[PDB]
């Protein structure tokens, strides 16, 4: 029910997610802020699934990463952030699993603009394009068709707009409100898209 989408590149990495806070057969909110968990140092951990597990896991990861970056006085690499998050999510898999679906994103001077897909079972791999939720069934082939390696920011935003229109048209949860993140030009930006 929680849709997440992410798209990599050479000059950008973009994320997008529905802003629906849901309980039972009603929407609590159309401006949910419980999904994006942007970290200091050009990093983001977009989560899906339960609101409680989202809050607990996202805050645990964010405060631990900030603890690292203040103890050592440096920015954490995005590969290190992604694998730290995967290891921490895996540690609780057999004990008390967080039902959270992870898209890690960020920028490094070392490895450029990075994006990592990962699921509640803690199976992770880097990707040029990823999505989570049942909406991932409907917004995956659109990303496959229109993605090329030398995209610009506007072309990626157009691809995301087509994905949102697909989610409105075909997915039974007619999701219309979305919030984005744009990591590009050594700056992080936010946007909101309706329909």
């Amino acid at each position: 029910m929680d849709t997440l989408i992410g798209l990599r590149g050479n000059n950008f990495v973009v994320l997008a997610a529905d802003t629906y806070s849901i309980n039972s057969i009603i929407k609590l909110k159309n401006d949910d802020n419980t999904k994006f968990y942007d970290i200091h140092g050009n990093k983001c951990l977009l989560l899906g699934g339960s609101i409680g597990d989202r809050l607990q896991f996202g805050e645990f990861i964010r405060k631990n990463v900030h603890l690292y970056q203040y103890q050592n006085n440096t920015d954490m690499f995005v590969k290190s952030f992604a694998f730290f998050t995967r290891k921490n999510l895996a540690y609780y898999l057999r004990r008390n699993p967080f039902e959270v679906n992870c898209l890690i994103a960020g920028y490094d001077k070392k490895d450029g603009y990075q994006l990592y897909w990962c699921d509640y079972l803690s199976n992770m791999d880097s990707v040029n394009k990823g999505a989570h939720g049942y909406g991932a069934y409907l917004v995956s082939a659109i990303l496959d068709k229109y993605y090329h390696e030398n995209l610009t920011v506007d072309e990626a935003l157009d691809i995301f707009k087509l994905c949102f229109e697909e989610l409105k048209k075909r997915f039974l949860l007619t999701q219309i409100n979305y919030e984005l993140r744009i990591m590009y030009d050594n700056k992080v930006e936010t946007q909101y898209v309706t329909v």
């Binding site: 805050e59 405060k63 900030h66 603890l67 203040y70 103890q71 006085n73």
Partner: protein, 225 residues
């Protein structure tokens, strides 16, 4: 001595180990803190052998969280472990309340930790005194000085370390309320320079604002008239 009383009362009534920790603080380098309307200035002595020791590695002014900073005097390894504990508690509070830790709370926590270490069994007192500076829940800035004894107190301006009394007197006879950033920096420089020799390399000074703890470049420290 896994569980033994290192800190105990003397025949007069004092705790000797706390006094010895105070002596260890007195051996430590000099640090100075001055307050202003919405910013603070912390300046601490540096001691580096020329041409061999890395200047950047020694770091007596430390950032604790988004909006707190620390400047210690005493034993360096004790300071490092206490600062790591303080950072851990800052992030623990920000996890358990969803607000950044205010300066008064974390100063009280450091004082409580030092009191606990002067009182539990099989543990040595911390040989360090700290000058934490930061911002409160109501956006007001203040500086808290904490002893090895576990007693804390807020200050408009304060000095710790070797020859702390002289710098305290100089701060007393030269402090004014709501002074500009240049004036505050200059006052901190001429205050900490009353006991350490007049040179640009024997000090590191930083300015704490709501946005971040900026460090003054060595060029700006130079040309102090």
């Amino acid at each position: 001595s896994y569980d033994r009383a290192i800190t105990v009362f003397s025949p007069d009534g004092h705790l000797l180990q706390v006094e010895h920790a105070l002596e260890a603080v007195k051996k430590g380098g000099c640090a100075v803190a001055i307050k202003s309307s919405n910013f603070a200035v912390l300046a601490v002595e540096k001691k580096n052998i020329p041409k061999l020791q890395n200047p950047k590695t020694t770091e007596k002014l430390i950032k604790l969280d988004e909006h707190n900073c620390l400047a210690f005097a005493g034993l360096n390894a004790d300071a490092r472990v206490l600062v790591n504990k303080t950072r851990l508690e800052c992030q623990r509070y920000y996890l358990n309340m969803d607000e950044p830790a205010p300066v008064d709370y974390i100063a009280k926590y450091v004082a409580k930790v030092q009191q606990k270490f002067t009182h539990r069994g099989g543990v040595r007192p911390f040989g360090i005194a700290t000058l934490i500076a930061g911002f409160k829940n109501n956006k007001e800035i203040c500086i808290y000085q904490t002893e090895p004894s576990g007693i804390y107190a807020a200050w408009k301006a304060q000095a710790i370390g070797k020859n702390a009394k002289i710098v305290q007197e100089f701060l007393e006879k030269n402090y004014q309320e709501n002074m500009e950033q240049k004036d505050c920096i200059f006052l901190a420089l001429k205050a900490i320079f009353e006991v350490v020799e007049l040179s640009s390399k024997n000090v590191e000074v930083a300015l704490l604002t709501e946005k971040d703890l900026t460090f003054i470049e060595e060029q700006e420290i130079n040309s102090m008239v």
